[PDB]
Design a binder for these strands. Structure first.
Lengths: 959, 417, 411
DNA sequence: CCAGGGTTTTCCCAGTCACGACC
DNA sequence: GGTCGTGACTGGGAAAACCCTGG
């Protein structure tokens, strides 16, 4: 029946599914390839181990266009990007009218005529635009000025915050405080290119309606990254070389992502201006009022530069990215939407409060020891302190330029007047001493810098500028590693001093040292271990990696019995929110009023009238990574959920409005699967051709043969170590890395044998190198050879959709350098194209069956869609069939004509009301000690598998 | 104990608590039967009460103060174990009149028991007596709260000192908050107030880790919490919170339900009562214990000092005179004294004492009193207007201009919070 | 009589006095049988106590605080008239067992009376026990004084309503001052304190002429002076001054007489005791009675008023006005001005009615926020004393308020 | 008798290194 | 391996407060 198998006994797709999705017939592999593959697998001895068959799945698909998978995808992509490319070419080939004479002064939009006539048009009416937005951050995040360009003429928009001067404005943004840039219901859809368009997008008025109007965007920064981008190391070296290894031609075919540098790289000409006054970054609303003309001129200059880059760039992008699916997906990664209810403000309050209280606890614990350290200055008691001796203990001199009886009432008044006058007389003696005040003299040198100066507006009493990272904090706490006092040198980082030097080496100690170069005679300076190897200096003892060292007895607080462990526990508590508090609290929210909410959301019983439901539009650079990934300052870097990190529930606070539920999933072992499938296509085109491939696909993690376990079995080390080594190897690492990590995980193995162990371990995994040169005899030799073949080609296209690598990484310019970056680029760019395929398929499938759906976020592998409550499982079925289609297409591009069932469907299409890793976890955070059902009352979502989905949905897509 | 003994010694010596060492037992201090407090102790309690009142009533728009009569006149519910208040005039008339009988005496005692008043054991029952009027005050807007600081009387049991069956009457000053909340918002406000109280007690503490919270339920299953302090001998209950529900509220006015309904938006409900009561005296002793370091790490740490939070220390600054013209310097010191008094700063009149104590001795004496700063006016001060300041925590000597002392002190006290 | 009843009704309506009209007896108010004061009354008493404490303890170096417990344990001298603290358990147990005769019951009652604790009637007794240590506090230098603002308890024998020997219990809060002074210049100190307290009481009054002083002498010859305020129905005691002499001190510690001596100059002598005692509750009533003039508005002195400024929201969008009002409210609270958060109420009562209501509550100034406030930054401000409406910059409201409070204080 | 030449001190800002967040 | 913030520290330059010079 539906059950079938491959020449390597792997459960493939069902007969109905395979017939629908693979046409009919194919050039099946020959017996010679089978014999070679079997011989290979036997040689490594991973052959035969069967697995419990996965249940057969049947599904009749909606009509698949074209006469092949690739043709169907391309037809869909043409349908998706038909209007957007037309508008893009319309704008690219169009006469640009002359710049306006003088920018007018009227709230909102204003149209500028060819001769300079100015007319306020209610809304722009053009199919394409290039947009620059200006934000006066001092007076909030409301947008201020907009100058727009179009085929007709320039357009200008100014906020009310510049025209009229009210007393105060609402601190929470309303939809009325944005720009009316939309086409209300001769054409449909519009394209607004721009530089860092995500920044410009967030101030567009209609992009906050959840109904999901038809519009897309293109970031020229994304295009530049995709075309002539630079890595982190590449960017650093570019900047350094401009300020003042071989194959330096790449310095001439790339630049950083600032607008001026891109202008120089593409069109060159005169260097763009900068406006050094930087009024928008720092200024005043009245100041921007007075200097309108120059600032608007700079905005229009930015618009013109962006247009120049876009026009001179768009043909090149298609010349290097000739698959329409790539552009179509790049359109859909920039339309992210996240809904946020009234629980946002309470979240900020709770996070800030918890952070503040823990900060106060830590700071007072430090200050207590700080103040007591002053009492070691009198009597020269600083000298004998084993820890506080080398700090600054120098004072500063103050600069300079009987009986009884009651009283009569008149006498009392006279005495009061006399005393007051005598006091006021001395107040005039100011005519001496420095005019600029001194800052706490008398206190020792170390103390004065800790305290703030009284001229500071936010001054607080005492040494309140103490954090655990300060170089004097550990000595102020007097930490003693293994009963040896600490010490810091900038030549070898932190460390501990062991007394016993008579002028060498220790008599009775071993460790990272001694280092005779840093000499404090009488002792030796060893080095604390780090998680990055001995070549790195330990920067701050109060670090995460020292948490095991708190309890094990190796590390002692010294001047405490329990403060130390509490100190590092508080450190780990507020570490994340310390960094994230700026951008987390700097986000924009447009609380959509009840008027603009959908009818259904209001009709829903769980709707709240007093509550406020709003949304956030993430700023995502669609291609900000050399691997063409997305870049988002906060959400791509947001902690998921933990019970020991403050503010770690940020993702969970993203909640659907009433009447909507989130539907999402996550790819499984994506990088490893792509490596395996590439290796299989390279060897014989059969799945499981390589040992790595079988371990990735049919590997039995429960009992027996699997990728993570098998490496451990060969080496003989713990499973966790083997997994770490395998991830490092797929990222690309050498033998010295392996030997260092092996010596780290076990101090009982000597390097003399550790080197042999590492070389044998690598030989088993990747294999040796014989000269015909390539990788042969290794369990993963085929995939490494395939990756290097793709990387070292003259024009390395992505294996899947053929988007060429960034021209700064071409072999013609780098040659035998940056190999690791390119080989990683192969896999990661394949993954990004895979995400694009997923998104385009999802868009088509949701448009085909009139599913009311929207995009939540594309967190690399993850995909989350926001769909209405009633058709929640229909969206799940759409996602599952999308996964099937995209994986089949991925296999077909390499040429394989079959796909295993075990990967044919998503493992868990999660339905939930708040984004989190699992629908089950309540994620009781330190800022929400009770729980989500108790602080905000969300239920645990339902997670479904393919069989459950087809059973609930009857395996159909219509209503 | 030795550290605790030293702390009790200091609190007696520098006039923090009043009484003799026999009366200064831990049980006496905890039970509400201590002989009294020293003047500095009264100042400390006043400061703590002021901070609590600000943080609870001042910064809440829906909370109002309430005053409970110190006694509850009868007739009372049967079974009450509270003491009875009897006028001495009635007893004098009873004992002087020789025409009375045994039966007349029995009838008189029955009448006294049936018609006697009681001292307040808790602030809650009297607080509810003002619910109708206070509800009218806030235009029937629920939630709303009533607060009150004052002394409540409790019984004390003992076995060693009690010879002739004498049951002692103990007094304790209590801060009570009655918070009337909609039933849907029971645990919401309960947790919120627990968090706020724990933050308030941790805010002024030198070592907040010794403060703790613990959840506990009553015999009826209504939710509650108890907060403790880690004394050198163990935790002591310093504050309790209970979700009383509505049993007490319905029992107080059983007549009609329509008078006691409260509005939560557009709906009228009978509200649930959250009662928050804390032990001021125990907390004062606890802050005294917290301020004193129990040194048991650096072996060379002398100078017993009382690191009270600056907003709670009883006397802010102290003045002294050095060598120079006594009359002019005294005029300067009196001027500075009046100036610092006019700005809400408590000042210790140290320039009046004629003892020529050594400077180290005076520094120790002012430190034991937990004085934030030591101000010294000398001949140079009359010369140019520079004054000295010895910070309690730092013990470092600095100089500031004499007109710059007022602003520095006010900014210090304000921003310390 | 109508005016007094009208004023009592006003104080009851606006939460100065608490309880029902029948429970609000003028005799009950004077004698301390009142059911309690309203929250506005609580704030008024707090302000009065603040001004008394500032005027007495803060500004004089020889006055130190003293804390006396509310009871005095047994045994007690016979003839004391204070309420006897009685445990109901023993009375019930004695009632249950009738085996004891009349004489045995009398003996038990006498034993209990000799061993019954008492509630304090005046802080004077408690202060003397603190004379030794508090004397040690000033290095034996005289004079020095003690003070304690607090409440006492006093018996009330209402001849109007007593049938079954029912004596009520009255509680009055009084401020005490015990000035241990050398005998040489005692009456000079007496005169100083007397004039000072007359000035203090007249300081906050609208018509200070209604306050008066009078001299008196006890049975033992101790000179004394007493202050009275002219309530509409008559003069009532508001504070008493007595030259107690040294009877109490000598009685207290009958052994080593030298230990209780005080150092006056170069000699050691027994000091004379001066007593200052006044009913802060009755003074609060006195000020309220003073404030009534016929527009019924309570013009309590600004330094003692319970509510200093009131806020409201005018016609316009609610949320913006509410946010601005909350900001202003927080700023005002942060700077030590007590405010009324009237901006929450939604009842569309007329501005005239609202002004009347706030004035009857003794509110110094009234701030209202409307759309024009968001337009330009001027807030409508109403003067209680002048019935004139002033528009002032919303930013500068707090400085104007604190200046008004200070200027009232120094005048 | 004061403006400045040169002196010094102090304030500030670009860069550097270690750290901890999602993949 | 790629990517993003941060904070503590630091060196060098710019702004502001001094000495005695002399016509």
């Amino acid at each position: 029946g539906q059950l079938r198998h491959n020449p390597l006994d792997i459960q493939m797709l069902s007969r109905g599914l395979h017939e629908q999705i693979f046409g009919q017939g194919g050039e099946m592999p020959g017996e010679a390839a089978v014999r070679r593959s079997v011989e290979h697998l036997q040689k490594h001895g991973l052959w035969g181990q069967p697995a419990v068959p996965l249940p057969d799945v049947e599904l009749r698909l909606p009509p698949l266009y074209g006469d092949n998978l690739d043709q169907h995808f391309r037809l869909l992509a043409q349908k998706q990007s038909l209007p957007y490319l037309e508008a893009a070419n319309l704008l690219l080939q169009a006469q640009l009218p002359p710049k306006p004479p003088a920018w007018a002064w009227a709230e909102g939009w204003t149209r500028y005529g060819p001769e300079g006539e100015a007319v306020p048009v209610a809304i722009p009416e053009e199919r394409a635009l290039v947009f620059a937005v200006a934000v006066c951050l001092a007076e909030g995040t409301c947008p201020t000025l907009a100058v727009a360009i179009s085929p007709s003429a320039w357009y200008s928009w100014c906020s009310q915050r510049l025209v009229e001067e009210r007393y105060s404005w609402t601190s929470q943004l309303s939809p009325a405080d944005l720009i009316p840039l939309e086409v209300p219901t001769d054409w449909q859809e519009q394209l607004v290119v721009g530089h860092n368009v995500s920044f410009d997008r967030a101030h567009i008025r209609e992009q906050y309606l959840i109904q999901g109007s038809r519009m897309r965007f293109l970031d020229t920064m994304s295009m530049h990254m995709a075309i002539s981008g630079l890595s982190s190391f590449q960017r650093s070296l570019w900047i350094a070389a401009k300020q003042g290894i071989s194959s330096w031609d790449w310095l001439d075919i790339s630049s950083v992502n600032s607008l001026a540098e891109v202008h120089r790289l593409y069109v060159g000409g005169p260097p763009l201006e900068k406006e050094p006054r930087e009024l928008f970054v720092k200024g005043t609303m009245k100041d921007i009022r007075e200097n309108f003309q120059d600032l608007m001129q700079y905005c229009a200059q930015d618009v013109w530069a962006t247009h120049e880059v876009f026009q001179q760039q768009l043909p090149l992008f298609l010349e290097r990215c000739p698959h329409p699916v790539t552009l179509a997906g790049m359109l859909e990664m920039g339309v992210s939407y996240l809904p946020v209810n009234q629980n946002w403000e309470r979240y900020l309050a709770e996070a800030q409060g918890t952070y503040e209280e823990l900060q106060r606890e830590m700071k007072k614990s430090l200050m207590d020891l700080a103040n007591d350290a002053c009492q070691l200055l009198s009597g020269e008691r600083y000298k004998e302190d084993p820890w506080l001796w080398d700090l600054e203990w120098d004072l500063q001199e103050f600069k300079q330029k009987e009986d009884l009886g009651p009283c009569s009432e008149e006498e009392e008044f006279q005495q009061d007047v006399m005393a007051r006058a005598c006091l006021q007389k001395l107040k005039g003696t100011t005519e001496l001493l420095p005019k600029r005040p001194q800052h706490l003299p008398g206190h020792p040198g170390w103390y004065r810098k800790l305290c703030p100066r009284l001229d500071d507006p936010a001054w607080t009493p005492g040494p309140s500028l103490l954090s655990l990272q300060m170089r004097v904090t550990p000595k102020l706490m007097a930490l003693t590693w293994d009963g040896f006092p600490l010490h810091y040198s900038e030549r070898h980082g932190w460390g501990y001093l062991v007394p016993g030097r008579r002028d060498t080496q220790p008599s009775y100690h071993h460790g990272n040292g001694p280092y005779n170069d840093v000499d404090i005679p009488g002792c030796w300076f060893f080095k604390l271990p780090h998680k990055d190897g001995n070549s790195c200096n330990v920067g701050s003892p109060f670090a995460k990696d020292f948490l095991p060292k708190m309890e094990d007895g190796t590390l002692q607080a010294g001047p405490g019995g329990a403060s130390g462990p509490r100190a590092l526990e508080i450190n780990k508590m507020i570490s994340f929110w310390r960094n994230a508090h700026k951008r987390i609290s700097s986000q924009m929210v447009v609380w959509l009023p009840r008027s603009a909410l959908p009818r259904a959301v209001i009709r829903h019983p769980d709707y709240d009238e007093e509550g406020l439901y709003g949304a956030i539009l993430p700023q995502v650079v669609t291609a900000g990574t050399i691997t063409r990934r997305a870049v988002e300052p906060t959400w791509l870097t947001a902690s998921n959920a933990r019970p020991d990190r403050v503010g770690s529930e940020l993702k969970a606070m993203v909640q659907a409005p009433p009447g909507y539920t989130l539907v999402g999933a996550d790819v499984d072992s994506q990088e490893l699967w792509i490596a395996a499938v590439l290796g299989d296509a390279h060897f014989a085109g059969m799945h499981g051709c390589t040992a790595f491939g079988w371990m990735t696909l049919q590997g039995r993690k429960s009992r027996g043969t699997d990728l993570h376990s098998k490496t451990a079995t060969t080496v003989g080390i713990s499973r966790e170590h083997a997994k770490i080594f395998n991830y490092g190897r797929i990222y690309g690492a050498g033998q010295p890395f392996a030997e260092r990590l092996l010596m780290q995980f076990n101090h009982r193995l000597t390097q003399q044998e550790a080197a042999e162990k590492a070389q044998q371990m690598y030989a088993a995994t990747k294999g040796l190198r014989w000269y015909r040169r390539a990788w042969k005899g290794g369990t993963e030799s085929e995939m490494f050879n395939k990756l290097e073949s793709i990387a070292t080609s003259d024009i390395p296209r992505t294996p899947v959709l053929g988007c060429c690598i960034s021209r700064a990484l071409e072999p013609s310019a780098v040659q035998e350098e940056f190999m690791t970056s390119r080989v990683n680029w192969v896999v990661q760019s394949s993954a990004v194209d895979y995400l694009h395929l997923m998104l385009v398929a999802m868009k088509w499938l949701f448009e085909e069956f009139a599913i009311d759906g929207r995009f939540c976020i594309s967190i690399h592998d993850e995909v989350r869609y926001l769909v209405r409550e009633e058709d929640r499982y229909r969206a799940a079925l759409a996602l599952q069939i999308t996964n099937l289609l995209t994986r089949c297409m991925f296999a077909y591009k390499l040429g394989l004509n079959d796909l295993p069932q075990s990967v044919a469907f998503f493992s868990a299409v999660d339905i939930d009301r708040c984004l989190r890793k699992e629908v089950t976890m309540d994620c009781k955070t330190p800022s929400n000690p009770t729980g989500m059902e108790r602080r905000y009352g969300i239920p645990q979502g339902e997670a479904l598998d393919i069989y459950q989905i087809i059973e609930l949905t009857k395996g159909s897509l219509e209503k | 104990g030795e550290g605790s003994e030293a702390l009790l010694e200091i609190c007696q010596r520098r006039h923090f608590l009043s009484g003799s060492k026999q009366q200064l037992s831990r049980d006496s201090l905890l039970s509400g039967c201590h002989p009294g407090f020293g003047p500095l102790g009264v100042e400390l309690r006043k400061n703590l009460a002021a901070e609590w009142w600000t943080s609870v009533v001042v910064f809440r728009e829906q909370v109002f103060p309430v005053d409970a009569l110190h006694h509850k006149p009868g007739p009372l519910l049967p079974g009450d174990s509270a003491f009875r208040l009897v006028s001495a005039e009635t007893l004098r008339e009873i004992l002087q009149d020789k025409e009375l009988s045994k039966e007349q005496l029995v009838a008189f005692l029955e009448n006294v028991l049936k018609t006697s008043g009681k001292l307040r054991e808790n602030l809650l029952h009297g607080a509810l007596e003002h619910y109708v009027n206070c509800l009218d005050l806030v235009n029937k807007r629920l939630p709303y709260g009533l607060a009150q600081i004052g002394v409540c009387f409790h019984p004390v049991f003992d076995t060693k000192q009690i010879r002739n069956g004498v049951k002692s009457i103990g007094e304790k000053t209590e801060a009570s908050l009655v918070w009337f909340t909609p039933p849907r918002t029971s645990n919401q406000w309960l947790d919120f107030w627990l968090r706020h109280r724990l933050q308030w007690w941790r805010k002024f503490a030198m070592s907040p880790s010794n403060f703790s919270s613990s959840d506990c339920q009553d015999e009826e299953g209504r939710k509650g919490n108890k907060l403790y302090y880690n004394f050198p001998w163990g935790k002591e209950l310093i504050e309790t919170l209970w979700n009383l529900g509505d049993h007490e509220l319905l029992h107080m006015y059983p007549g009609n339900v329509s008078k006691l309904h409260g509005r939560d938006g557009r709906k009228n409900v009978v509200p649930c009562v959250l009662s928050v009561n804390g032990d001021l005296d125990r907390g004062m002793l606890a802050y005294l214990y917290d301020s004193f370091q129990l040194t048991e790490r650096k072996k060379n740490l002398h100078r017993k000092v009382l690191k009270l939070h600056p907003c709670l220390a009883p006397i802010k600054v102290a003045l002294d005179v050095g060598r120079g013209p006594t009359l002019e310097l005294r005029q300067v010191c009196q001027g500075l004294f009046n100036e610092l008094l006019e700005n809400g700063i408590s000042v210790w009149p140290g320039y009046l004492e004629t003892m020529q104590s050594s400077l180290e001795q005076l520094y120790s004496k002012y430190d034991e009193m937990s004085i934030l700063f030591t101000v010294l006016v000398t001949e140079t001060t009359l010369e140019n207007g520079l004054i000295h300041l010895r910070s309690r925590d730092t013990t470092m000597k600095e100089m500031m201009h004499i007109s710059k002392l007022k602003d520095f002190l006010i900014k210090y006290i304000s921003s310390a919070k």
